[PDB]
Symmetry: C5
Subunit: 208 residues, 5 copies
Amino acid sequence: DYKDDDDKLDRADILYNIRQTSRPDVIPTQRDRPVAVSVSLKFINILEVNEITNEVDVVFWQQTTWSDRTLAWNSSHSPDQVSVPISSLWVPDLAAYNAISKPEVLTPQLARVVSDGEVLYMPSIRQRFSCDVSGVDTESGATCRIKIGSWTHHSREISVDPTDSEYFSQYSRFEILDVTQKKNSVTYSCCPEAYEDVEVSLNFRKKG
Amino acid sequence: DKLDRADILYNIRQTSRPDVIPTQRDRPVAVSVSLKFINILEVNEITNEVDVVFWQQTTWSDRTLAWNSSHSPDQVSVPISSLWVPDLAAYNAISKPEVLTPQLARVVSDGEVLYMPSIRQRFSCDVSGVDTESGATCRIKIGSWTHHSREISVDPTTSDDSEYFSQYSRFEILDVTQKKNSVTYSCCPEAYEDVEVSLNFRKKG
Amino acid sequence: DYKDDDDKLDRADILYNIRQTSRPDVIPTQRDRPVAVSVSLKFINILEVNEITNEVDVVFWQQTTWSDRTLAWNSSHSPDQVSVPISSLWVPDLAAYNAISKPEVLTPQLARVVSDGEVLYMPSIRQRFSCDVSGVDTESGATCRIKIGSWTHHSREISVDPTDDSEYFSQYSRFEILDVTQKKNSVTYSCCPEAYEDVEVSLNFRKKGRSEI
Amino acid sequence: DYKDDDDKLDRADILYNIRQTSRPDVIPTQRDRPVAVSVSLKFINILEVNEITNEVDVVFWQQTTWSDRTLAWNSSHSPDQVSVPISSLWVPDLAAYNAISKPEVLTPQLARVVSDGEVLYMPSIRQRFSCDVSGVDTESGATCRIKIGSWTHHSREISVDPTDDSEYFSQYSRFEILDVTQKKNSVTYSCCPEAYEDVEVSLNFRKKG
Amino acid sequence: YKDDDDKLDRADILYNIRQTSRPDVIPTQRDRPVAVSVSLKFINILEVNEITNEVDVVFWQQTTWSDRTLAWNSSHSPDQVSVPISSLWVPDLAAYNAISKPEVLTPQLARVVSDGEVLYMPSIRQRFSCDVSGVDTESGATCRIKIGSWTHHSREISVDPTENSDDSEYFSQYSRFEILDVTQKKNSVTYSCCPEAYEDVEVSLNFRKKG
Ligand SMILES: CC1CCN(c2cc(-c3ccc(C(F)(F)F)cc3)nc(N)n2)CC1
Ligand SMILES: CC1CCN(c2cc(-c3ccc(C(F)(F)F)cc3)nc(N)n2)CC1
Ligand SMILES: CC1CCN(c2cc(-c3ccc(C(F)(F)F)cc3)nc(N)n2)CC1
Ligand SMILES: CC1CCN(c2cc(-c3ccc(C(F)(F)F)cc3)nc(N)n2)CC1
Ligand SMILES: CC1CCN(c2cc(-c3ccc(C(F)(F)F)cc3)nc(N)n2)CC1
Ligand SMILES: *[C@@H]1O[C@H](CO)[C@@H](O)[C@H](O)[C@H]1NC(C)=O
Ligand SMILES: *[C@@H]1O[C@H](CO)[C@@H](O)[C@H](O)[C@H]1NC(C)=O
Ligand SMILES: *[C@@H]1O[C@H](CO)[C@@H](O)[C@H](O)[C@H]1NC(C)=O
Ligand SMILES: *[C@@H]1O[C@H](CO)[C@@H](O)[C@H](O)[C@H]1NC(C)=O
């Protein structure tokens, strides 16, 4: 409960509990079900766009959530949440398939763990992508698709699902017309199991 | 006295909880935040991006860290890896902060902790009017990333806006003002506090 | 067992087992033979091509597999596979001889270990290479050759065996792929008496949007 | 003594002793007198200068020495010195106030520790600075001043004191050095009551004809 | 020879090496300096600037030395193993006229031989301040790289040129440049800073742009 959120000893104790129970390297599967991972992108900026090379430089708030019930505690008279370094926690091994640079994480690498076992990690990230830039200077604009999925965990182990101008910079050379998100389950010739992904389509165009 | 310093550092490391907000008994950690500009380096009026260097003055209190200094040092420098530090982020930065200075804080015997790095960073802010007399006005917002208003409060602190500013920049500081906000986002039920730092500057004619 | 894949305690236990057994700095040689390392590149993208300096910037999916049977376990009623951080495992010390930048690994550094002892690591990597770019703007295209082999382990310790398509190749690349061929070599250099194996990957590619009459 | 410098077990024993005594995070203050740190810069190169932005990219040899007598040992029959990773040692928290990039350390991060307790750390560094570039094409040259001081230790705790000019300077630089002068400041800022010492290095340089 | 692929033997040799290795102590033997051999074979010349006298090169840095305390009996065990360099002492070498950090392109493993010889041979990309003048002339330019121990003087570490193979044996046929020749020489030099001499190896290569 909220009147206890600032009891420091309580938070320290919860962090200790979390660190004893957490298995940073094991998927927190429950009920012989895949871990349900939620993923949405809220765009913060569009910095560089190249219509010749089909490359973009974007900043986005990647909202990522899932649950590990082994981490839950009774919060009747203790903090409902604490911030935890992600190195103490399991995080889904998500990758953006068409990213062409490493993600540059702009924000402190702390997640929130909620007393019901929900884990929230929502970093702001700048990253470069290979996507369809054609039309960026037209009224229809461009539609750049970013596919994000678990790299090493197939659909039996991890499912992914969705969790834009509210946080989009008014100062960008560009403007968002629409962001849509859909989910796919796809199998490659490499592997017999399917890998789920969230595909985020960013329709945008140069201002004016 | 070195041994006295070694002992204070030991005490600090015994008591310090680097991953726990130091809020006690019941009040959100009061964090003081102030920017003193050092330099303005790259200004792109087309892409609306700036590249700046600022002294980020950050102070707060952890009274569990306090000690009686009647016959021992008043302060020691401590590596920030040994201390809790607020998880501040500049929302409109478009690059990671480049910390130019040694990552050491001062801990004072009354529990005050001061961290004040010099930081070069790239921002997305209004650069329109930089070449005019009124100047541009670049707004930088800084607040706690994962801690809302019940856990951390963020506040302004104040001399001359150009005291530490480089005479060799192509730019000059007309005015710096800092304002506090508390904003709830559609994502979450709690408010997060921030300092909006308004830097009014123009090219030197 | 496929049903038992999501038994969490089971996964945790296999991981513990693997870490007890794994020797991350020791080649997993079995029956007095070299570790057979399989290597295959699937190109994902060609980003920058400089016809003058003969350089390319490519993203490729480097599929590496090998066997360490000491890692095997009975999966009759347990997960068939688990993901393991590469820092917990031996990984072949592969190097691209003509690369001119460090490999930029774009994906999480986890391998899959299979209950029969097969270990799979398949990172996506962006890297720059010194290669023949000549002809990239013609029908026949350019052919850029990339060599990958073990850096410190010779043929008695590690063997590399290699195993179009544009299945994973971006349709948004300025370039398109005509053919990919992969040859195995065992070469002896004057520095050293023992040979080193490599796979030589021949990427035949050309610009889309070439001048056409 | 020098005749025992290469006794390996002796060196390993000295290293062990140093690591037992060393407090990497505690200033080695003696008799409560501020640790005296010498700082000298010998310029290696000037790589790129920008008259419009007043920025300079330089490479310099940053000669830093101080003492920690707790590290001393009797070298009558053992090595007079050994090299030690700086991570095992206290190093002064020096910062260059007008640097606009992180210092790029070109050399192995080892210090020398002498048996009298002297510690020497002299890295080669490439760094960008904001400084007066004007006059670079004249004969009077330009004068770019670099200030270096302890970041968190004021004058009661650390004092800095400046320790030919082109001896290590690259003959292949587009530029040449007319003069280097090194002076000591002790400055109080509005932020804080205590003074912070610095060494101000004035580099007078110009483009070659 | 027959015993190289005995994995338990290899693990035991690694254990032995790690037990006796002193990664931070020079492996001096019988009160004499560690003899470090260093040689560069060039892989590539990437970017050249005649105005600024800067050069971007890839080279194979062949570095060898001896640590006899690591030696073992290889009669019925492997003759060599690979070892992460973090487990071993490696000479603190620096390129004096390097103007950027060395970008190591290869895995950071050395070989240790049963007779105690250690071989580390990274492929490195690095940028240098050197004489670029004459690069597009038939005579070419001559860029000189000096490499020596940074903190160990001549009583502790000697550096020696190695050994010939063709100068272009590993050089990219696709570079815009071609190597005319490479020479190496040892120097031993005293600086105003220090009483002792520091040894270095000076690599001079005359290279030119293809025409
Ligand atoms: C561009 C951003 C958009 C979101 N926004 C936020 C979000 C957050 C936030 C809240 C919760 C999390 C959680 F840890 F739960 F994942 C992360 C960030 N914090 C702050 N101070 N500002 C303002 C600037
Ligand atoms: C570049 C494309 C992206 C989609 N696709 C894959 C491959 C894989 C993948 C990665 C690694 C393995 C491993 F090595 F661990 F077995 C298996 C599948 N995972 C996902 N989510 N997508 C094929 C390559
Ligand atoms: C540009 C390179 C130079 C030689 N060459 C080598 C050298 C080496 C090699 C041999 C021995 C070592 C040692 F560990 F001993 F130092 C390192 C690399 N390994 C491979 N696979 N290829 C291929 C092309
Ligand atoms: C650009 C440099 C200037 C001095 N010089 C040096 C200095 C040093 C040196 C001496 C002592 C230290 C010490 F550890 F004491 F600090 C550091 C470097 N070593 C070598 N090999 N060369 C040659 C070229
Ligand atoms: C950038 C300007 C010029 C240098 N100057 C300072 C500030 C500081 C300083 C003082 C106190 C702290 C503290 F630890 F308290 F946070 C940090 C830096 N130190 C030095 N040597 N010079 C004022 C800021
Ligand atoms: C601190 O210690 C000193 C001497 O030990 C004593 O004067 C003092 O009362 C203590 N602190 C206070 C004033 O509370
Ligand atoms: C592996 O162990 C299981 C135990 O359930 C048992 O079936 C058998 O001993 C092994 N598997 C096979 C081949 O039956
Ligand atoms: C140092 O050691 C020498 C050699 O035994 C000895 O003669 C001398 O007394 C020692 N010096 C001191 C004061 O420790
Ligand atoms: C090493 O091998 C034999 C083992 O039969 C051992 O007894 C002896 O010490 C060594 N002999 C040599 C030098 O090969």
